[PDB]
């Protein structure tokens, strides 16, 4: 029984997919432990992507994530971390993600891949701390 | 352009309908202005339910709920439209949330403000700094 | 907590709606107590249809049907609710099985018992040892 | 067996509902006899809208529409059934196209001929050689 | 044109997926040749899993399959056997089954993978005999 | 931003999947630039399959494509060509196409795989010319 962080980015919201994404998580048999539509401080953004901070085009990541509010959620259940990455699909919506996955069905571009899921037990634990301090 | 309060009660959550209900709202053309899964204090429960009375509080507080501010043209009427009448079998038409998923008035899954006055008041309690 | 008889007639099957119809029942919160794809003897057909009369028997017996016992709170009313009025265009509302998929009264896909007395009798014929 | 004209207006297209609307028609048991995404000349727009008047033409011509001939038993009534009343919130029931997706009468996504006379005339304008 | 055995196990039923699973089969273009909700005798259970009888944790398989009634069905059509295994997904719902498949979309655990489909022409013929004697 | 040709063959229409297929394209984020239900001349058919003209069973391809009207469409958007082939699935609906794809979910036979999508920038440009002369 694991906990993982899930974000529905501003592009997932504008395209009216909040409900859709939650549904897919619920139906996989996972539970929404925490859920909140919120804004992202410039620092929370940099803290989230801190790992890719050095990398190229880092700045563009922060710009988008703060352009509108996001839906943050704690997803909980058996193999929650792997399962969510499964539902989401690979990073490139066309060359990687299979159809039937969130990105596979709805996305065309890596920048606008709608959703985020923690990639490891360590990442989840850290990301959950930033997004849900008192959890 | 109106704002209305929407609750997905503990029964809507256990039956895995959070996503479903939000989707229906989004597709009607409304926007989720605020959204939070939270617990309900005893006072908040009691004061929300002005209108057996006890079995309600034990219900609304038995688990966390999803509270939301829904915003858009005729948001109040539209949400009550999507939800259906109160009795899921004798009132709500199929195609509505209650019409499609509910059998009992107690467990009708969802709540929507019933008037401009109710919304304004309910939103205050559920989203103080809004 | 009631029990009602449900039939998915040969037209519902050919149009690939078995799954669809069961899903709608399950999601309303009802339970499939019994379920069987079977053929209909001439007597069973005739005796089911007490209420042109001949074209019916030739229909109900033209292929196998899916018989089911549906069980739950207000099961009888709920199923008739999901199904819709008899005339798919002039009576049944959209969102209902007939409302969404049917055009003709003859081919309205599905049957649900119309009363506590009817259910009890119909269940006896279709599921003798129940 | 009737023929009726159906339009998916520019608002239905921008909201990505072409597929959705066609699906609902197909599943009711109707057939798409003709189908074309096209632009609307000013005369065609004006003459279609015999029944603020100006904001309509600017709407129907603001982008291409999907025109279709829908054919089948009671096609005319059935399509108006699927579509819902004109005011998406006060008239159309949920389960209908307008009931599920629309909030405003101006942007009610879709059009269906309202009578045998209207269909025959509208089909002539939109599909001259039909 | 093949025939294959399909079971909707007690977990598929409790999770309200009978309709869902049948729908997916129908839409693939297959036909329900036989269909019945029934209980499973202790021996029918052992006869079904006879192959994995020796294997470890064999007993736990029999316990679950008999804990509630199942929906048995004969599915018929072109490549029915392969098609059904396709719709179902690999055995491990998270590490094997792709999303879009029954297990891929709804399951987290191998024990509770909701559904069964014959794995070969020989298996189908034998399994159909046990579950639908006069077929 | 690419343009690709899409056909909903006579089998996709008889099985009532026009709406379904368009929906999947729209939801991926692509736009229907052109759309028309039409009949296929014997020559248009041979012009379309001109590449496989020499190949065996060529004649059977022309027979089917002309047996009823088809829905032709120009699909437009980012990576439109790859995306559409993604949504469609591999050619053999059972051995290649994954579930979640059009062929994966609805087809059993290669002949009746419901749908067509241009396979390259060169193919699209040529196919669009034949199907939508004044485009």
Author numbering:
A (entry chain A), E (entry chain A), F (entry chain A): 2 to 136
B (entry chain B), C (entry chain B), D (entry chain B): 2 to 52, 58 to 136
Report text from the authors:
Nucleoside diphosphate kinases (NDPKs) catalyze the reversible transfer of the phosphoryl γ of nucleoside triphosphates to nucleoside diphosphates. The two-step reaction proceeds via a covalent intermediate, the enzyme being transiently phosphorylated on a conserved histidine residue, His117 in Mycobacterium tuberculosis NDPK (Mt-NDPK). Crystal structure of the Mt-NDPK has been solved. It is a hexamer with a tertiary and quaternary structure very similar to other hexameric NDPKs.
